Design a protein around this ligand. Sequence first.
Ligand SMILES: [Zn+2]
Lengths: 260, 5
Amino acid sequence: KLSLQDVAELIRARACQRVVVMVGAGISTPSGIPDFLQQYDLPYPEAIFELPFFFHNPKPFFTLAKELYPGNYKPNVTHYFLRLLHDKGLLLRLYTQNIDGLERVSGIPASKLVEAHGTFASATCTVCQRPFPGEDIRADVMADRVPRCPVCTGVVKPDIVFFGEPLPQRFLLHVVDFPMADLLLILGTSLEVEPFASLTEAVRSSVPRLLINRDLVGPLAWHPRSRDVAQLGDVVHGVESLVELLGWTEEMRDLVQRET
Amino acid sequence: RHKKX
Ligand SMILES: [Zn+2]
């Protein structure tokens, strides 16, 4: 096995400069966003991202949308470390399962992001499929009213991907990004679930896979490879020690006070 | 098939 310092030295050298990153809920809880009775009036947790429930009752989802609008949460060190990889020309693609939009907020350009469970930044009429900037429904949501299509009256839904829905078109970038990956960084998610779990195996056997996660689970556990590295513990701590090892301490502080 | 889940 390699160590956190080796990976750090591989990046520091720029021997690694096409980094593919995959992130999940573990990077958001330090911003104070929860992951999980639940006061939202749901029959079960997943009903909040099901289309028939939503058609029957769009209110709980809109309560979450209102809560996740810009200004409730800020990015944390983990997002700002990813922004630094971008600023140093190292980021090939950032794949995110979160819907808090904090990757964009930390100033990572959209062209670098695959928001694989979608985004509140835009919205779509559930009936006639007309697209709308998320601004267009902001006031309705911010007032607890259900936003409606100005042509057909259909409920207008923010472009969060619900159960049973195709992943967004930009997800198709995985077909080129994962063979091109010279390094795979997995932060705050186990990636237990398809198609994300297989993506961990789409990189080239020569390519290190660095997990910064609490425990060691998922396909990094199930089908480990020679050049895997685990850095288990608090994600924030792990990223900070990676940052430390890269020598990016000052750059991190600079970026954090520039942005926040 | 890539769908959410
Ligand atoms: Zn419509």
